[PDB]
Homo-oligomer: A and B are copies of this chain.
Amino acid sequence: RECISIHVGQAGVQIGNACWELYCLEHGIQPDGQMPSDKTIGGGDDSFNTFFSETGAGKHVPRAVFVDLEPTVIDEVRTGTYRQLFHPEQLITGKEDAANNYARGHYTIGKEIIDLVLDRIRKLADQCTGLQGFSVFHSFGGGTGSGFTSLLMERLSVDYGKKSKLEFSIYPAPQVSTAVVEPYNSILTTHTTLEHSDCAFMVDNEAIYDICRRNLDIERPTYTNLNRLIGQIVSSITASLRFDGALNVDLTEFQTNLVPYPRAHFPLATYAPVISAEKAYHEQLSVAEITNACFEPANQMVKCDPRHGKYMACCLLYRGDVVPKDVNAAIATIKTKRTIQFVDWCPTGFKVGINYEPPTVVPGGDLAKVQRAVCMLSNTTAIAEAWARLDHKFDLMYAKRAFVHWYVGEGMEEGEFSEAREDMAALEKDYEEVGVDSV
């Protein structure tokens, strides 16, 4: 039940330290080092409070990797709400960053920093033998982003054998973005890091924008809100490993439950019973509306019609915390009468999973006390349009050969961009060939 996470990019380190602060606040891992529930300093390793290692004389540290070439991000992290108990010996950063592109950080200037973080990965890999994949935080154009990942996934799949891993791809939002060439780095990231992967799921910042401004009636699009929401969502995801309950199955069980194919690889994370100080005051929580409000279009990370969205799988995650009795009542109150449009020639068995021992809600945030979780990790074969729109914009901007000259002299060629277009066209046309329902 042991895993060590790496984080690259500025927004990657932001969601990383936000989620780790939420972890340390909800396990009682105080900034005093020890957890006051027992008498073990630093942390613990018993069954599920197992995000630590015996570094000192029982001293335990929240093992994670924070990497970005731009050096001030780790300084502004280290002066945050969890100040001094981050690692004083592995916070490795560069001097000058790639500054919002792909090619320079990957091929040219990162080639003398890949081996340093590789040696750090080896030194942390000489530690405790628990291994159930990885947890890689990255974006498409936030910090270095694609530049580290496009090399390190190949390096992990060649150097470290055929070991499983998992990654976090932050899907961008042009209304709050900071670049224009995001189709190019998106298509390059999608042909590179997905074919050398084992598990992934894409989170859209525009989906957060939609569920905030269009579903919660708040008026603040700042990355702190995104960091807190990602902390909540990834905490709910990891809470199966973090707390033991009735169906306390591992993340290896999840990744050997979800993925059907190397190409058919991505879920539609369905968790929008949206909450804040507004939508948590004097409401009533039930197992009907939070489960009936899943398949609708304005609840999704990636946009899809419910009838046009075909569920190859309909896996579910529950935070539980009261009983499994009402969950096994809602398996007939909601889950049994589901004749919703499905995929042909595949089993139609709905899955549920409940994990007890409540993760504590965010302190000092916006949401009030909430109980349930409807993190229904389905998948959708009609997310081919969600990248076909980017391929269409990339076609309408790529025939003009815009921004090519910044991506010529750093090693690649026009054949690489043709191969990236070929790979995304292959993925999409494979979905309308056999992914979307066929004969």
Contacts and interface: CB of A to CB of B under 8 A. Distances in A.
A58 B337 contact: yes
A292 B41 contact: yes
A339 B54 CA distance: 8
A388 to B, nearest CB: 14
Interface in A87-128: 89, 123, 126-127
A417 B306 CA distance: 48
B306 A55 contact: yes
Given A291-B57, A337-B58, A340-B54, A123 B296 contact: no
Given A123-B308, A308-B123, A296 B56 contact: yes
A41, A292, A305, A340: residue with the most chain B Cβ atoms closer than 10 Å: A292
A56 B308 contact: no
A53 B337 CA distance: 13
Contacts of A57: 291-296
Contacts of A296: 56-57, 59
Contacts of A305: 55, 89
A302 to B, nearest CB: 14
Interface in A366-389: none
A56 B308 CA distance: 11
A381 to B, nearest CB: 13
A155 interface: no
Nearest to A293: B57
A429 interface: no
Nearest to A124: B307
Contacts of A294: 56-57
Contacts of A295: 55-57, 59
A70 B337 CA distance: 41
Contacts of A337: 58
Nearest to A296: B56
Contacts of A53: 307
Interface in A236-275: none
27 contacts: A41-B292, A53-B307, A54-B339, A54-B340, A55-B295, A55-B305, A55-B306, A55-B307, A56-B294, A56-B295, A56-B296, A56-B306, A57-B291, A57-B292, A57-B293, A57-B294, A57-B295, A57-B296, A58-B292, A58-B337, A59-B295, A59-B296, A89-B305, A123-B307, A123-B308, A126-B308, A127-B307
